[PDB]
Each structure stands twice: as C-alpha cells, then as structure tokens.
Design an enzyme around this catalytic site. Structure first.
Site, PDB file in Angstrom:
ATOM      1  N   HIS A   1       0.847  -1.195   0.000  1.00 53.88           N
ATOM      2  CA  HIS A   1       0.000   0.000   0.000  1.00 53.88           C
ATOM      3  C   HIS A   1       0.888   1.252   0.000  1.00 53.88           C
ATOM      4  O   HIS A   1       2.101   1.183  -0.191  1.00 53.88           O
ATOM      5  CB  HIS A   1      -1.032   0.000   1.141  1.00 53.88           C
ATOM      6  CG  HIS A   1      -0.437   0.143   2.523  1.00 53.88           C
ATOM      7  ND1 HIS A   1       0.135  -0.920   3.185  1.00 53.88           N
ATOM      8  CD2 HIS A   1      -0.373   1.198   3.377  1.00 53.88           C
ATOM      9  CE1 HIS A   1       0.559  -0.525   4.375  1.00 53.88           C
ATOM     10  NE2 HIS A   1       0.264   0.756   4.518  1.00 53.88           N
TER      11      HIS A   1
ATOM     12  N   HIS B   1       1.688   3.913   1.933  1.00 47.64           N
ATOM     13  CA  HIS B   1       2.418   4.544   3.018  1.00 47.64           C
ATOM     14  C   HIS B   1       3.924   4.331   2.881  1.00 47.64           C
ATOM     15  O   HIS B   1       4.407   3.445   2.169  1.00 47.64           O
ATOM     16  CB  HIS B   1       1.945   3.992   4.358  1.00 47.64           C
ATOM     17  CG  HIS B   1       0.580   4.458   4.754  1.00 47.64           C
ATOM     18  ND1 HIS B   1      -0.249   3.739   5.590  1.00 47.64           N
ATOM     19  CD2 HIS B   1      -0.077   5.606   4.472  1.00 47.64           C
ATOM     20  CE1 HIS B   1      -1.358   4.420   5.800  1.00 47.64           C
ATOM     21  NE2 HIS B   1      -1.286   5.551   5.122  1.00 47.64           N
TER      22      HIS B   1
ATOM     23  N   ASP C   1       6.343   3.087   4.741  1.00 48.20           N
ATOM     24  CA  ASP C   1       7.039   1.827   5.029  1.00 48.20           C
ATOM     25  C   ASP C   1       6.855   0.783   3.933  1.00 48.20           C
ATOM     26  O   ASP C   1       7.441  -0.306   4.024  1.00 48.20           O
ATOM     27  CB  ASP C   1       6.617   1.262   6.420  1.00 48.20           C
ATOM     28  CG  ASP C   1       5.084   1.029   6.598  1.00 48.20           C
ATOM     29  OD1 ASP C   1       4.221   1.669   5.929  1.00 48.20           O
ATOM     30  OD2 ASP C   1       4.737   0.198   7.492  1.00 48.20           O
TER      31      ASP C   1
ATOM     32  N   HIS D   1      -6.503  -1.691   6.934  1.00 49.46           N
ATOM     33  CA  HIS D   1      -5.517  -0.700   7.366  1.00 49.46           C
ATOM     34  C   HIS D   1      -5.463   0.510   6.444  1.00 49.46           C
ATOM     35  O   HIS D   1      -5.217   1.643   6.901  1.00 49.46           O
ATOM     36  CB  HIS D   1      -4.149  -1.340   7.421  1.00 49.46           C
ATOM     37  CG  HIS D   1      -3.038  -0.354   7.538  1.00 49.46           C
ATOM     38  ND1 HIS D   1      -2.639   0.168   8.749  1.00 49.46           N
ATOM     39  CD2 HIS D   1      -2.237   0.206   6.602  1.00 49.46           C
ATOM     40  CE1 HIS D   1      -1.626   0.997   8.558  1.00 49.46           C
ATOM     41  NE2 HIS D   1      -1.385   1.063   7.258  1.00 49.46           N
TER      42      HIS D   1
ATOM     43  N   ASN E   1      -2.645   3.602  14.563  1.00 49.95           N
ATOM     44  CA  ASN E   1      -2.815   4.744  13.670  1.00 49.95           C
ATOM     45  C   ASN E   1      -3.678   4.320  12.484  1.00 49.95           C
ATOM     46  O   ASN E   1      -3.279   3.537  11.610  1.00 49.95           O
ATOM     47  CB  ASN E   1      -1.448   5.318  13.246  1.00 49.95           C
ATOM     48  CG  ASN E   1      -1.354   5.637  11.758  1.00 49.95           C
ATOM     49  OD1 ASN E   1      -2.230   6.292  11.179  1.00 49.95           O
ATOM     50  ND2 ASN E   1      -0.266   5.190  11.140  1.00 49.95           N
TER      51      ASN E   1
END
Ligand SMILES: C=C(C[C@H]1O[B-](O)(O)c2cccc(F)c21)C(=O)O
Ligand SMILES: [Zn+2]
Ligand SMILES: [Zn+2]
Length: 231
Positions: free
Chosen positions: A83, A85, A87, A148, A179
């Site tokens: 995805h 983000h 990381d 998520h 988060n």
C-alpha cells in the site's frame, strides 16, 4: 529465532529464511518518537528475485539490496508495494535506480502521488475489487477489501504456504490500534474474514510489523480492531 525490534539498529536489515527460496526482510525505523520493526518478503523465481515492499526509506532499502547481494546473490528484478504509506513505498526510488521494476495497484500509485510519497512505476491489473486475486510470478496477490488502508494488498507464497498480511495484520504483541487515519474500521474485520476464507491452509503468517505467527494473527487483529471501535 525471528529478529526483534530491539535487535536491529535503524539502518541495518536482517533476512530471515522461511523456506526454500522464501525470505522475509526485517528493518527498523523511527516514527513519531518510537522505533518500529517492519517486514517484507523476498521470493525466488528461478534466477531472479521478487521483492515485496521496501525496507522503509532510502537508506534501509539500499542496505536491503546490499544484504541480498551478500546473502543470496540473485538480482531483484521486480518489486510490489502493498500500500501507499512510506514503510511500503519509501525506497522505491532506490529500487528504481538499481534497475528494479516497481509495481503497485493503480489506487496505491494514486494515493502515493496524492500523499507526496514515492510512486511505483508500473500498475498491477486485476485487483480493483474485494476478493480479487492474481498470480504475479511466484506469489499470489490478493485484495481483501479496505482495512488498514483502502488499497492494502496481501500476498501469498504457494510454495511455502506463507501469508504476508502487510499492515492489515497485527502481531500478537500489538494490543492497540496502530494509527488508523487511513483505515476503514467498519470494513477491516470483513476484509480479514476474506483473507481467512481464501488462505485457510496458511502455515506462516507475517504481519506488517513484528513477529510472525499463524492464522491466529487474523483473529487477534480483528479483536484489536473491534476493541478500538467500541471505545
Ligand atoms: C503503528 C503502525 C505504523 C506503521 O504503519 B503505517 O500506517 O504503514 C505507517 C506510515 C508511516 C509511518 C509508520 F511508522 C507506519 C501501523 O500499523 O500503522
Ligand atoms: Zn500503512
Ligand atoms: Zn505499516
């Protein structure tokens, strides 16, 4: 045996061999005051390697590629980000610059551009709807539905019965929601059920962050997610 967050200095990358031609990679990064471990995957396909997710940042991803040369000695030719983000896409530019063809779903590439993050070059077809799955070299890519994030992919390695959950699956030690600004909390338990129904014979389940387990990590994740939602 699996390396833990307190064992990995930020900037170094561990490989853990799960089965023949199947490794996870473990690195660590500082975020909002704390140091997190983070997992991805390396899967051998004959004389080449598929990479699942970056090592979270340019520095770590360069250390990743260096550890692969030393320990494995096969080239990474393709990478998938699960995805949008940092990381998961942070370090795409290092991969691109080293010759790796970088991939993600159209949604992930768009969310990455909108957020200011690094953008994989190539779009993955066939993953637009919940329950969609496609084979991609030695792995199966599965879009379980929003969890998520709205774009999150999970990855299955058939040869080894390995299920990589990315940031949609929590480790047992994680008992609070991590988060959820981009999460769909109402849909996450249903998306997890889709994973269970699709990979009921998974032997080794890898969360996005932390220690691997079994399919018990899916039930744990649902518990953490529902607990956050009710209060
Ligand atoms: C608590 C973790 C943080 C980790 O995950 B992330 O949301 O992909 C993401 C983005 C940026 C930084 C970062 F540390 C993370 C979680 O499950 O969300
Ligand atoms: Zn995330
Ligand atoms: Zn994460």
């Amino acid at each position: 045996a699996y390396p833990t967050v307190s064992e990995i200095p930020v900037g170094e990358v561990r490989l853990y061999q799960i089965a023949d031609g199947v490794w996870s990679h473990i690195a660590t990064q500082s975020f909002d005051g704390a140091v997190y471990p983070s997992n991805g995957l390396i899967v051998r396909d004959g004389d080449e390697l598929l990479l699942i997710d970056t090592a979270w940042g340019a520095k770590n991803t360069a250390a990743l590629l260096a550890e692969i040369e030393k320990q494995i000695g096969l080239p990474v030719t393709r990478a998938v980000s699960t995805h949008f983000h940092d990381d998961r896409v942070g370090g795409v530019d290092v991969l691109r610059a080293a010759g790796v063809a970088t991939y993600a779903s159209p949604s992930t590439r768009r969310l990455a551009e909108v957020e200011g993050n690094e953008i994989p070059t190539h779009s993955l077809e066939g993953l637009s709807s919940s329950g969609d799955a496609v084979r991609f070299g030695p792995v199966e890519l599965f879009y379980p539905g929003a969890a998520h994030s709205t774009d999150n992919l999970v990855v299955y390695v058939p040869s080894a019965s390995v299920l990589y959950g990315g940031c949609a699956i929590y480790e047992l030690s994680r008992t609070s929601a991590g988060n959820v600004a981009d999460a769909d909390l109402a849909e996450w338990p249903t998306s997890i059920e889709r994973i269970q129904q699709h990979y009921p014979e998974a032997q080794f389940v890898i969360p996005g962050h932390g220690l691997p387990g079994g399919l018990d990590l899916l039930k744990h994740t649902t518990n953490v997610v529902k607990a956050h939602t009710n209060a």
